Design a binder for this molecule. Structure first.
Ligand SMILES: CCCCCCOc1ccnc(NC(P(=O)(O)O)P(=O)(O)O)c1
Ligand SMILES: [Mg+2]
Ligand SMILES: [Mg+2]
Ligand SMILES: [Mg+2]
Length: 338
């Protein structure tokens, strides 16, 4: 598996990223806080999004054009995608009242950090553009990349807004939890930046900036991102917490989860009341009653059937829209999420 091999060489390159970013002695203490933010928050995940930049790059560029510099730009931009992710996560864990992330306590829960994490998160964002300028400003794709990262921020932040507006704290919400609202939320908050962004960045770096091709790519990747978020929702409640590295909050947080959307579609009137009285509250007793209703409605089996139908669907889409890009570009990614 192309992702599996590249992982260590990609992780290995992180020391250089920090080196170039953490280097005006007056702001010395600030750069030391930045490194500390980077070490804690950019490391520990699976790196699928940044690896996608490196894997798609190798697969799109002609070997005779994969020199040292060209390859260094590729994994620098992969690390830019990782930085964007770290930024999103640090801020989202505050807003979601999360406890752990990637197998350690959330950055904003660390004694001595707190709501300072808000500035820490935005520093991670700033680092993307620091890196693009340091390594890509003389490439013809400089502006394309800047605009693509900026639009991705906007996209996810618009998605996050939908997320929060559909999960008002303290408000029985069930009427809002529809398939159509769910699909919108995750298209913007997850699918664009987790799937379109890294393939698109690699495309631009390869000189593939045709609109039709990006649209065809996008068509594949947004549907992959939709399943990816549905899987995240499933894992929030039903995943092994020692594998996911994070504790679920969706029920307590009144989130428009794929699970609750599927519950409302299958719930008897009597079961709908169970949901209405227990969802979106902090009481452990009430959360557990939601989980029992899901398991009683066999949502774990409904997720299982959905993952296989969705897989076949993405596969159909790759056959439709991959050309002229190599199929492996999307099969590598799809293999890593299914
Ligand atoms: C200014 C930045 C606003 C924060 C943006 C956060 O964006 C996202 C996008 C996609 N996923 C997440 N986190 C996901 P999780 O917390 O890792 O499970 P969630 O959506 O289920 O909460 C978070
Ligand atoms: Mg969230
Ligand atoms: Mg969250
Ligand atoms: Mg989640």
């Amino acid at each position: 598996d192309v992702y599996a091999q590249e992982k260590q060489d990609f992780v290995q390159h992180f020391s250089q990223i920090v080196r170039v970013l953490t280097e005006h002695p007056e702001i010395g203490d600030a750069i030391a806080r930045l490194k500390e933010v980077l070490e804690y928050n950019a490391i520990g995940g699976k790196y699928n999004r940044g690896l996608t930049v490196v894997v798609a790059f190798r697969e799109l560029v002609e070997p005779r054009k994969q020199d040292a510099d060209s390859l260094q730009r590729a994994w620098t931009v992969g690390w830019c995608v990782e930085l964007l992710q770290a930024f999103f996560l640090v801020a989202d864990d505050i807003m979601d009242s999360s406890l752990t992330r990637r197998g350690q306590i959330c950055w904003y829960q660390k004694p001595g950090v707190g709501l300072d994490a808000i500035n820490d998160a935005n520093l991670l964002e700033a680092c993307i553009y620091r890196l693009l300028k340091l390594y890509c400003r003389e490439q013809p794709y400089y502006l394309n990349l800047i605009e693509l990262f900026l639009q991705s921020s906007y996209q996810t932040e618009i998605g996050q807004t939908l997320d929060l507006l559909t999960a008002p704290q303290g408000n029985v919400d069930l009427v809002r939890f529809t398939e159509k609202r769910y699909k919108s939320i995750v298209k913007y908050k997850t699918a664009f930046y987790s799937f379109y962004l890294p393939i698109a960045a690699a495309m631009y770096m390869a000189g593939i900036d045709g609109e039709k091709e990006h649209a065809n790519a996008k068509k594949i990747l947004l549907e992959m991102g939709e399943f990816f978020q549905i899987q995240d929702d499933y894992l929030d409640l039903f995943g092994d917490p020692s594998v996911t590295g994070k504790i679920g909050t969706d029920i307590q947080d009144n989130k428009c989860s794929w699970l609750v959307v599927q519950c409302l579609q299958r719930a008897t009137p009597e079961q709908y009341q169970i949901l209405k009285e227990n969802y979106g509250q902090k009481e452990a007793e009430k959360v557990a009653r939601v989980k029992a209703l899901y398991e009683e409605l066999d949502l774990p089996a409904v997720f299982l059937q959905y993952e296989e139908d969705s897989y076949s669907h993405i596969m159909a889409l790759i056959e439709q829209y991959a050309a002229p890009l190599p199929p492996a570009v999307f099969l590598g990614l799809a293999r890593k999420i299914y």
